[PDB]
Amino acid sequence: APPIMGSSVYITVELAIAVLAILGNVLVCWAVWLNSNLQNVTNYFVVSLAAADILVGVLAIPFAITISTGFCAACHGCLFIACFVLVLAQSSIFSLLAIAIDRYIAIAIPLRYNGLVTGTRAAGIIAICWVLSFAIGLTPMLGWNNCGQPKEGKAHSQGCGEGQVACLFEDVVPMNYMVYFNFFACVLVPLLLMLGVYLRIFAAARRQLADLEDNWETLNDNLKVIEKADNAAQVKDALTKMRAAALDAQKAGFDILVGQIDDALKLANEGKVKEAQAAAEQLKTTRNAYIQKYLERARSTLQKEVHAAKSAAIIAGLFALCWLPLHIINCFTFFCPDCSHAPLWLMYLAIVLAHTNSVVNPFIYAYRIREFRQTFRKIIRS
């Protein structure tokens, strides 16, 4: 069956993917430019990630279409077109890892976040990461390639010239580089690291949203204890505890609260039980009017952070889902030489799926993040 029909389907699909990758990601980048509420450090990594996807459509996809033809080319030029996508995938990994870390900093140490994670430090990190991405992805160009052992029988059959090879990914890029260096070290390890960062993010969230609840219960149970108490010393016990739990909430209305606990304690230390109890009853007014509003705000903010962290995790998860099959196929090719090579149709499918990852991010932002969604609408409307 003529190779141009099988190759026609693959190519059309690649072109559809490129179109969509470019479109969606230009809109991400355009949204961040226009909306100042989307101008934060997290979103600069998002933009870097969008840039990489734009380049998959503009460059990586045309390169892959090109190399699918097996056209004659100087080996090192062939190399470049085979490996450029690795640079883009690496850049993406760095961006995803940074987003995970950024979100972890925001939830673990919100006090120090703004001064630690600035836009200036973020742009420097992005630049460094792009340089590193070029180094990792283009490592084969530094000598780890099969250009030294060309398939001359395959090159002579297609009438290639001197110094040229039939340009095919697996003929030029060593599988050991693909499996051990690229997959294990540069993809798998950073993905496992991301998994770990997200676990810590979700656990820290759980611990804080438990802690908020505990402190509130403490305030309410110590009120009851004070309400039915025998003497002044019991009242003093329950307000000494209450005081400490109000000062931790203030670090993590409060002027009034501590003050009122203090009023009650002085009375309690003078042996006046009924007066201490009545003064402690006034604490209820403060709890309703201020403290409960703080508990519910703080809770809301933590829920917003968990949601935003889930959205970022989904993105990282989708990268793994889209890229893993191609990596897994490479493992079979490398580790199992007695196994028949995965068919060309499957290679095409795995490649296309990897490329499809460059289309997905804009949809996740639209479905999961209000500010992006609202800005996408205005850009589209106008």
Ligand SMILES: CC(C)CCC[C@@H](C)[C@H]1CC[C@H]2[C@@H]3CC=C4C[C@@H](O)CC[C@]4(C)[C@H]3CC[C@]12C
């Ligand atoms: C959830 C996602 C990440 C998992 C996807 C796993 C895919 C990539 C796995 C599942 C079954 C696997 C196939 C099982 C059997 C063979 C026959 C062998 O001669 C070549 C590899 C090949 C064809 C494997 C290629 C990879 C494969 C298709």
Ligand SMILES: CC(C)CCC[C@@H](C)[C@H]1CC[C@H]2[C@@H]3CC=C4C[C@@H](O)CC[C@]4(C)[C@H]3CC[C@]12C
């Ligand atoms: C979920 C994460 C850890 C994904 C990474 C899992 C990868 C590395 C695993 C999953 C399935 C595994 C393959 C299963 C079967 C074979 C056939 C055997 O003859 C050689 C090893 C080989 C080819 C394995 C290599 C490693 C492999 C591809």
Ligand SMILES: CC(C)CCC[C@@H](C)[C@H]1CC[C@H]2[C@@H]3CC=C4C[C@@H](O)CC[C@]4(C)[C@H]3CC[C@]12C
């Ligand atoms: C994190 C998880 C998913 C990794 C799982 C990797 C598993 C599937 C890998 C790790 C070590 C691998 C084995 C290592 C050695 C051999 C000998 C070879 O003659 C046949 C395949 C076989 C028997 C492999 C089968 C797949 C294997 C068991």
Ligand SMILES: CCCc1cc2c(=O)c(-c3nc(C)cs3)c(C)oc2cc1OC(C)=O
């Ligand atoms: C059809 C597009 C060209 C092409 C690209 C690739 C390719 O991009 C990879 C990659 N694997 C990873 C992990 C990242 S990229 C592999 C293993 O085989 C390929 C084989 C290819 O087709 C030929 C016949 O040359």
Ligand code: NA
């Ligand atoms: Na990407």
